[PDB]
Amino acid sequence: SGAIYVGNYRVVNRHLATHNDWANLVWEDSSRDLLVSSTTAQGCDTIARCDCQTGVYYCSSRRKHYPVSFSKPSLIFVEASEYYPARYQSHLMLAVGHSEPGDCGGILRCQHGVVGIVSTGGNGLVGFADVRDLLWLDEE
Ligand SMILES: Cn1nc(CC(=O)N2CC(C(N)=O)C2)c2ccccc21
Ligand SMILES: [Zn+2]
């Protein structure tokens, strides 16, 4: 589990969104595994606006933050899980690292701020849903 709290937005994995998230929906995209809902309080996270390929992510199944090198956001084939059939997921970045299903939501960050959240995993891989192209998170 986990979310990004920027401005009056809450960014979560679409597959982990709650009823309150769907009832206060701003935007969702199943191909990216992302959903954004509105919040009453302002958040403290800052979004990175950069092309970094190195950063650090939080792994809840290890209680640890790990430094990683990650690929550029792309269209990647992801195996079937409890939440999606086997399919192509867009705006996804891969790194070598530990991930279990419940690790979804952990933040990946670089020197500029939040880059994305854990979305996929398996066999020493971890996938991150990028948010750096969502410029509207910084306004309204
Ligand atoms: C974080 N992660 N995820 C999965 C499968 C899963 O629940 N999916 C893949 C997610 C998606 N965005 O399509 C939903 C896994 C399987 C072993 C290890 C780590 C893992
Ligand atoms: Zn950066």
From Swiss-Prot:
* Active site positions, chain numbering: 15, 33, 104
| Top-rank lineage group of the source organism | Viruses
Per UniProt, Zn(2+) 1 binds at 50, 52, 110, 112
Q: Which reaction does it catalyse?
A: Selective cleavage of Tyr-|-Gly bond in the picornavirus polyprotein
Which positions make up the signal peptide?
none
* Summary of subunit composition and partner proteins: Homodimer.
Function (record text) = Cysteine protease that cleaves viral polyprotein and specific host proteins. It is responsible for the autocatalytic cleavage between the P1 and P2 regions, which is the first cleavage occurring in the polyprotein. Also cleaves the host translation initiation factor EIF4G1, in order to shut down the capped cellular mRNA translation. Inhibits the host nucleus-cytoplasm protein and RNA trafficking by cleaving host members of the nuclear pores. Counteracts stress granule formation probably by antagonizing its assembly or promoting its dissassembly.
Descriptive protein name: Protease 2A
- Source organism: Coxsackievirus A16 (strain G-10)
The lineage, from the top, is: Viruses, Riboviria, Orthornavirae, Pisuviricota, Pisoniviricetes
Section covered of the full-length record: 869 to 1008 of 2193
